[PDB]
Amino acid sequence: PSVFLFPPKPKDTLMISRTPEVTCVVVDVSHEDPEVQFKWYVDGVEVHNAKTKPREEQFNSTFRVVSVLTVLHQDWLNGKEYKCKVSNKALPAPIEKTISKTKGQPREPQVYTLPPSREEMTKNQVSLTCLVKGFYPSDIAVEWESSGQPENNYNTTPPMLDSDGSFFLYSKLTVDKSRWQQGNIFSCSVMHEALHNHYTQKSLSLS
Amino acid sequence: FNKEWQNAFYEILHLPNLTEEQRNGFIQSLKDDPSVSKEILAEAKKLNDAQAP
């Protein structure tokens, strides 16, 4: 009988088109006592819009129970604390976990695009790189598009702590060497709390 | 009681090739986010070395 609390996705807390949520995951609920009660608080005050999902029996016949609380973008961004209180027959006393956005002076990402190495141009596919550095906190989102159409064949490294106490990451979009060589325009867009409008986008093409 | 946190602070306090400005930045980092003390100390040790006389 144990509890985990997860934060919203960074893109969700940043885009008004999205709905962010905090999630409370209880594992190893006994089959003998699958009843689980969730009480949620925001800065100490009780809210009631949480929703419990259909429980999931595990291979060993224990249950897994998830509670999901939609939150306000601005409450998460301004540092409110989200507390989940978990209740079950099997528990001596109820369990509490709390979560909140990472504190510290925010710092605006710098965003640079880098073209394929010349040695890479012998291959069928090439590598378009975006360097994102200097940002704080680590919560960030990254996508790629080409003339407004989404790309999918990209991989973005987890943020990594740099030598000045800010974070950095690289995102690599893989594309057919043909599309690169015939001058198609690629764009990486980055979403972060410290950018004007929570986003910027930087373009890359053959010159 | 967080040993790693207290330890990162101590070792950073005594690193001889950091500026006061850098020393201060790393100690503020440790306060902002204790859960990454290991990585803050590694970054500090790595900067202290690159700044050997």
Coordinates of C-alpha atoms in Angstrom, one line a residue:
Chain A
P1 CA 0.0 0.0 0.0
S2 CA 2.0 3.0 -1.3
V3 CA 1.6 6.4 -3.1
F4 CA 3.1 8.4 -5.8
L5 CA 2.3 12.0 -7.0
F6 CA 3.1 13.2 -10.5
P7 CA 3.2 16.8 -11.9
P8 CA 1.5 18.0 -15.0
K9 CA 3.2 17.8 -18.4
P10 CA 5.2 21.1 -19.0
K11 CA 3.5 21.8 -22.3
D12 CA 0.1 21.4 -20.6
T13 CA 0.9 24.0 -17.9
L14 CA 2.1 26.5 -20.6
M15 CA -0.4 26.3 -23.5
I16 CA -4.0 27.6 -23.1
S17 CA -5.0 25.0 -25.7
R18 CA -4.2 22.3 -23.1
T19 CA -5.5 21.1 -19.8
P20 CA -2.9 20.3 -17.1
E21 CA -3.3 17.8 -14.4
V22 CA -1.7 16.4 -11.2
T23 CA -2.0 12.6 -10.8
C24 CA -2.0 10.4 -7.6
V25 CA -1.1 6.8 -8.2
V26 CA -1.7 4.2 -5.5
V27 CA 0.0 0.8 -5.9
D28 CA -0.2 -2.5 -4.1
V29 CA -3.8 -2.1 -3.0
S30 CA -4.9 -5.4 -1.4
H31 CA -7.6 -7.3 -3.3
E32 CA -9.2 -7.8 0.2
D33 CA -9.6 -4.0 0.4
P34 CA -9.8 -2.2 -3.0
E35 CA -11.7 0.7 -1.6
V36 CA -9.5 3.8 -1.9
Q37 CA -10.5 7.4 -0.9
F38 CA -8.7 10.5 -2.2
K39 CA -8.9 13.9 -0.7
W40 CA -7.2 16.8 -2.6
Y41 CA -5.9 20.1 -1.3
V42 CA -4.5 23.2 -3.0
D43 CA -2.4 25.4 -0.7
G44 CA -4.2 23.8 2.3
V45 CA -7.8 24.2 1.0
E46 CA -9.9 21.3 -0.1
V47 CA -11.1 20.9 -3.7
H48 CA -13.5 18.5 -5.2
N49 CA -13.1 18.2 -8.9
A50 CA -10.8 15.2 -8.8
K51 CA -11.8 12.0 -10.7
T52 CA -10.9 8.4 -9.9
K53 CA -10.3 6.1 -12.8
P54 CA -11.4 2.5 -13.2
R55 CA -9.0 0.3 -11.0
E56 CA -6.6 -2.0 -12.7
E57 CA -6.0 -5.6 -11.3
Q58 CA -2.3 -6.5 -11.5
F59 CA -0.9 -10.0 -12.3
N60 CA -0.6 -10.9 -8.6
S61 CA -4.2 -9.7 -8.1
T62 CA -3.2 -6.5 -6.3
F63 CA -4.9 -3.3 -7.6
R64 CA -3.6 0.0 -9.0
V65 CA -5.8 3.1 -8.5
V66 CA -5.3 6.5 -10.1
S67 CA -6.7 9.9 -9.2
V68 CA -6.4 12.8 -11.6
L69 CA -6.9 16.5 -10.6
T70 CA -7.2 19.1 -13.3
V71 CA -5.4 22.3 -12.2
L72 CA -5.2 25.9 -13.3
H73 CA -2.1 26.8 -15.4
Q74 CA -1.6 29.9 -13.4
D75 CA -1.8 28.1 -10.0
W76 CA 0.9 25.6 -11.0
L77 CA 3.1 28.4 -12.5
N78 CA 2.8 30.6 -9.4
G79 CA 3.9 27.8 -7.0
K80 CA 0.7 26.6 -5.3
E81 CA 1.1 23.3 -3.5
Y82 CA -1.0 20.3 -4.3
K83 CA -1.6 17.8 -1.5
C84 CA -3.2 14.3 -1.9
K85 CA -4.5 12.4 1.1
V86 CA -5.0 8.7 0.6
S87 CA -7.3 6.5 2.7
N88 CA -7.7 2.7 2.8
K89 CA -8.8 0.0 5.2
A90 CA -5.3 -1.6 5.1
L91 CA -3.6 1.6 6.2
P92 CA -2.5 2.4 9.8
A93 CA -2.9 6.1 9.2
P94 CA -3.8 7.8 5.9
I95 CA -0.9 8.8 3.5
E96 CA -0.1 12.3 2.3
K97 CA 2.2 13.4 -0.5
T98 CA 2.5 17.0 -1.8
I99 CA 4.0 18.4 -4.9
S100 CA 4.7 21.9 -6.4
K101 CA 6.7 23.5 -9.2
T102 CA 10.5 23.6 -8.8
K103 CA 11.6 26.8 -7.1
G104 CA 14.3 29.1 -8.3
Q105 CA 14.9 32.2 -10.4
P106 CA 13.6 31.5 -13.9
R107 CA 16.0 31.9 -16.9
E108 CA 15.0 32.2 -20.5
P109 CA 16.2 29.5 -23.0
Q110 CA 18.5 30.4 -25.8
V111 CA 17.7 28.4 -28.9
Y112 CA 20.2 27.5 -31.7
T113 CA 19.7 25.4 -34.8
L114 CA 22.6 23.4 -36.2
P115 CA 22.8 21.8 -39.7
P116 CA 24.1 18.3 -40.5
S117 CA 27.8 17.7 -40.4
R118 CA 29.4 17.4 -43.9
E119 CA 30.5 13.8 -43.0
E120 CA 26.9 13.0 -42.3
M121 CA 25.9 13.8 -45.9
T122 CA 27.1 10.4 -47.2
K123 CA 24.1 8.7 -45.6
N124 CA 20.5 8.2 -46.7
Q125 CA 19.2 10.3 -43.8
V126 CA 20.5 13.3 -42.0
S127 CA 20.4 14.9 -38.5
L128 CA 19.0 18.4 -37.8
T129 CA 20.0 19.7 -34.4
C130 CA 18.5 22.1 -32.0
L131 CA 20.5 23.2 -28.9
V132 CA 18.5 24.8 -26.1
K133 CA 20.5 26.2 -23.3
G134 CA 20.4 28.5 -20.3
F135 CA 16.9 27.7 -19.1
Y136 CA 15.6 27.3 -15.6
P137 CA 13.5 25.5 -14.2
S138 CA 14.0 22.2 -16.3
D139 CA 10.3 22.0 -17.3
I140 CA 10.3 22.4 -21.1
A141 CA 8.7 21.2 -24.3
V142 CA 10.0 20.8 -27.7
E143 CA 8.5 20.0 -31.2
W144 CA 9.5 20.2 -34.8
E145 CA 7.5 21.2 -37.8
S146 CA 8.1 21.8 -41.5
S147 CA 6.1 24.7 -43.1
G148 CA 3.4 24.3 -40.3
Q149 CA 3.1 20.4 -40.6
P150 CA 4.2 18.4 -37.6
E151 CA 7.3 16.2 -37.9
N152 CA 7.4 13.0 -35.8
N153 CA 10.8 11.5 -36.4
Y154 CA 12.7 13.4 -33.7
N155 CA 14.1 12.7 -30.3
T156 CA 14.7 15.2 -27.6
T157 CA 17.2 14.5 -24.7
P158 CA 16.0 15.1 -21.1
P159 CA 17.2 18.3 -19.7
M160 CA 20.7 18.2 -18.2
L161 CA 22.3 20.4 -15.5
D162 CA 25.0 22.7 -16.9
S163 CA 28.0 24.4 -15.3
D164 CA 26.2 27.7 -14.4
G165 CA 23.2 25.9 -12.7
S166 CA 20.9 26.3 -15.6
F167 CA 19.8 23.4 -17.8
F168 CA 20.4 22.3 -21.4
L169 CA 19.1 19.8 -23.9
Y170 CA 19.5 18.7 -27.6
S171 CA 16.7 17.7 -30.0
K172 CA 17.6 15.8 -33.2
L173 CA 15.2 15.6 -36.1
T174 CA 16.0 12.9 -38.6
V175 CA 15.1 13.7 -42.2
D176 CA 15.7 12.2 -45.7
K177 CA 18.9 13.7 -47.2
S178 CA 16.8 14.5 -50.3
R179 CA 14.4 16.9 -48.4
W180 CA 17.5 18.6 -46.9
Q181 CA 19.4 19.0 -50.1
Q182 CA 16.5 20.4 -52.0
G183 CA 16.2 23.3 -49.5
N184 CA 13.1 22.4 -47.5
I185 CA 12.6 24.6 -44.3
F186 CA 12.6 23.0 -40.9
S187 CA 11.6 24.6 -37.7
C188 CA 12.1 23.6 -34.0
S189 CA 9.8 25.3 -31.5
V190 CA 10.4 25.4 -27.8
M191 CA 8.0 26.0 -25.0
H192 CA 9.0 27.4 -21.6
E193 CA 7.7 29.6 -18.9
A194 CA 10.4 32.3 -19.4
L195 CA 9.9 32.9 -23.0
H196 CA 7.5 35.6 -24.2
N197 CA 4.2 33.9 -25.0
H198 CA 5.7 30.6 -23.5
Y199 CA 7.2 29.8 -26.9
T200 CA 9.7 30.6 -29.6
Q201 CA 10.6 28.9 -32.9
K202 CA 13.8 28.8 -34.8
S203 CA 14.3 27.7 -38.4
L204 CA 16.9 25.7 -40.3
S205 CA 17.5 25.2 -44.0
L206 CA 20.1 24.7 -46.7
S207 CA 21.7 27.9 -47.9
Chain B
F1 CA 17.9 14.2 7.1
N2 CA 19.6 14.7 3.7
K3 CA 23.3 13.8 3.7
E4 CA 23.9 14.4 0.1
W5 CA 22.5 17.8 0.3
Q6 CA 24.5 18.8 3.4
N7 CA 27.6 17.2 1.8
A8 CA 27.3 19.1 -1.5
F9 CA 27.1 22.3 0.4
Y10 CA 30.2 21.6 2.5
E11 CA 32.4 20.5 -0.4
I12 CA 31.2 23.5 -2.5
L13 CA 32.0 25.9 0.4
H14 CA 35.6 24.7 0.4
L15 CA 36.4 24.4 -3.4
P16 CA 39.5 26.6 -3.9
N17 CA 39.2 27.6 -7.6
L18 CA 35.7 29.0 -7.6
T19 CA 35.0 32.7 -7.6
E20 CA 32.8 34.0 -4.8
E21 CA 30.1 34.6 -7.5
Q22 CA 30.2 31.0 -8.6
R23 CA 30.4 29.6 -5.1
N24 CA 27.3 31.7 -4.4
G25 CA 25.4 30.5 -7.5
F26 CA 26.0 26.8 -6.7
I27 CA 24.9 27.3 -3.1
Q28 CA 21.7 29.1 -4.2
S29 CA 21.1 26.2 -6.7
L30 CA 21.3 23.8 -3.8
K31 CA 18.6 25.7 -2.0
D32 CA 16.4 26.0 -5.0
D33 CA 16.4 22.3 -5.8
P34 CA 17.9 19.9 -3.3
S35 CA 16.9 16.8 -5.3
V36 CA 19.7 17.5 -7.8
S37 CA 22.6 18.1 -5.3
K38 CA 24.6 15.3 -6.8
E39 CA 24.6 17.0 -10.2
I40 CA 25.2 20.5 -8.8
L41 CA 28.3 19.2 -7.0
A42 CA 29.5 17.4 -10.1
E43 CA 29.1 20.7 -12.1
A44 CA 30.9 22.6 -9.4
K45 CA 33.8 20.1 -9.2
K46 CA 34.0 20.2 -12.9
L47 CA 34.2 24.0 -13.1
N48 CA 36.7 24.1 -10.2
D49 CA 39.0 21.9 -12.1
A50 CA 38.8 23.7 -15.5
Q51 CA 39.8 26.9 -13.5
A52 CA 43.0 25.4 -12.1
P53 CA 45.8 28.0 -12.0

